[PDB]
Structure 1
C-alpha cells in the first residue's frame, strides 16, 4: 500500500476490509456537533527532553522513535483511563496549503498534521500487541498551519536532508516532543483507528484544537523528502494522508465550548 494513484487510500479496502469499518479514522470534525464533556479530566502530556532515539524515512512518512521502556514520556487524562507511553511521532502533509491534514475541521484541511502515537503498555506486552486492541492506542493529533518559523522545528527540519531517501535513518537525540505542542490543551476526542494499514480500530483519538505554525520554508523541507529509494526515479513524499471517513454515529466530544 501507499499514497500513489495505484495504491492510495481509495484502494486500501481492497486489501484491508476493515477500511470500511464502524470506527475508522480520520474524520471531519463538525465543531457544532461536538459534545461538550466537562466530565473529562485534564489532558496532560508529560514528556522528557531526551527520550528520542532516531529519525527515519520509512517510505510513508518521516518518523521519530522513542525509548518506551517506562513512563517518562506519556499522555494521560482527557478520555484516557490511564497513562499511554509515547512510541513515536510522524507527520502527514500535502503539496499545497489547502491540503495535507488527515482530520479536517468543519471541512477545513491544514497543510500538515502531526501524530504522537502512544500505547497502553500497562495492559499490553508490545506496541504491536496494543495496536490490535480497542483500548490499545492513544494518538494525539496536532494541526500545523504555515506562517511564522517554528524555532524548535528547525532541529527536525534540518535533519530531513539526511533521510530524504526511503529506508534511511539517523540518530536524533534529545528532541522533546513537547516543543511541537500548542499552548492550549483543549481537544476533541472520539474512538477511531490507525489511519494506515492494517487500519485496526484500536485508537482513542485526541485532536488538539489549536494548531502550531511553521514557516513555508520549514514545510518545504518535508515536501523535499522522497517516497522513493536512492536508486530510483524520484517521487516526492507528498499527500501522504488518508481522507475523512464515515462517522457512523460515533460521538465526538470536546473539552471546550465552541
Structure 2
C-alpha cells in the first residue's frame, strides 16, 4: 500500500477491509455540528525536552521517535481516562498548498497536519497491543498553515536532507514536541482509527482547534523528501494523506463553543 495512483487510499480496502468500517479516520469536522462538552477535563500535554531519539524516513512520512519507557512525556485529560505516553510524531502534507492535511474543518484543508501519537502503556504491554484495542491509542492532531517562519521547526527541517531517502534515519536529541503546539488547548474529539493500514479502530482523536504556522521554505523542505530509496528513480514524498471518511453516526465533541 502507499499513496500512489495504483496503491493509494481508494484501494486500501482490497487489503484491509476495516477501511470501510464504522469508526474510520480522518473525517471532515463540521464545526456547527460538533457538540460542546463542558464535562470534558482540561487537555494537558506534559512533554519533557529531551525524550526524542531519532528522525526517520519510513517511506510514508518522516517520523520522530521517543523514549517511552516511563510517563515523562504524556497527554492526559480531555476525553482520556488516564495518561497516554508519546511514542512518535509524524506529518502528512501535499504537493500543493491547498491540500495535505488528513482532517478537514468545514471542508477546508491545510497544507499539512502533525500527528502526536500516544499509547495506553499503563494498560497494555506494547504499542502494537494497544493499537488493537478501542482505548489503546490517542493521537493529537495539529494543523499547519504557511505564514511566518517557525523557529523550533528549523531544527526539524534542517535535519530532513539527511533522511531524504526512504529507510534512512538520524539521531535527533533534545527536541521538545511542546514547541510544535499552538497557544490554545481547545479541541475536537471523536473515536476513530489509524489513518494508514492496518487502519485499526483504536484511536481517540484529539484535533486542536488552532493551527501553527511555518514558512513556505520550511514546508518546501518536507516536499524534498522522497518515497524512494537512494538507488531507485526519485519520486518525491507528497500527498501522503488519507481523505475524509464517513462519520457513520459518530458524535464529534468540542471543548469550546464555536
TM-score in terms of structure 1 length: 1.00
Which residue of 2 is the match for residue 144 of structure 1? 144
Once the two structures are TM-superposed, the CA of residue 252 in structure 1 deviates from its matched residue by: 0.1
Q: Could you say what the CA RMSD is over the residues aligned between the two structures, in angstroms?
A: 0.3
What is the CA deviation profile of residues 66-94 of structure 1, one whole-angstrom value per residue up to 9, with x for unaligned ones?
00000010000000000000000000000
Cα separation, 1, equivalents of 2:103 and 2:154: 25
TM-score in terms of structure 2 length: 1.00
Once the two structures are TM-superposed, the CA of residue 121 in structure 1 deviates from its matched residue by: 0.1
Cα separation, 1, equivalents of 2:150 and 2:102: 21
What SS does the aligned partner of 1:228 have? coil
Which residue of 2 is the match for residue 6 of structure 1? 6
Cα separation, 2, equivalents of 1:205 and 1:99: 20
Structure 2 residues without counterparts, runs of 5 or longer: none
Once the two structures are TM-superposed, the CA of residue 38 in structure 1 deviates from its matched residue by: 0.3
Structure 1 residues without counterparts, runs of 5 or longer: none
Once the two structures are TM-superposed, the CA of residue 33 in structure 1 deviates from its matched residue by: 0.2
Moved >6 Å (runs of 4+): none
What SS does the aligned partner of 1:116 have? strand
Once the two structures are TM-superposed, the CA of residue 132 in structure 1 deviates from its matched residue by: 0.7
Cα separation, 1, equivalents of 2:161 and 2:21: 38
What is the CA deviation profile of residues 42-86 of structure 1, one whole-angstrom value per residue up to 9, with x for unaligned ones?
000000000000000000000000000000100000000000000
Which residue of 2 is the match for residue 242 of structure 1? 242
Cα separation, 1, equivalents of 2:86 and 2:241: 21
Once the two structures are TM-superposed, the CA of residue 97 in structure 1 deviates from its matched residue by: 1.2
What is the CA deviation profile of residues 197-229 of structure 1, one whole-angstrom value per residue up to 9, with x for unaligned ones?
000000000000000000000000000000000
What is the CA deviation profile of residues 112-132 of structure 1, one whole-angstrom value per residue up to 9, with x for unaligned ones?
000000000011000010011
What SS does the aligned partner of 1:90 have? strand
What SS does the aligned partner of 1:210 have? coil
| Matched residues, number | 258
Cα separation, 2, equivalents of 1:190 and 1:96: 28
What SS does the aligned partner of 1:158 have? helix
Cα separation, 2, equivalents of 1:5 and 1:246: 22
What is the CA deviation profile of residues 119-166 of structure 1, one whole-angstrom value per residue up to 9, with x for unaligned ones?
000110000100110000000000000000000000000000000000
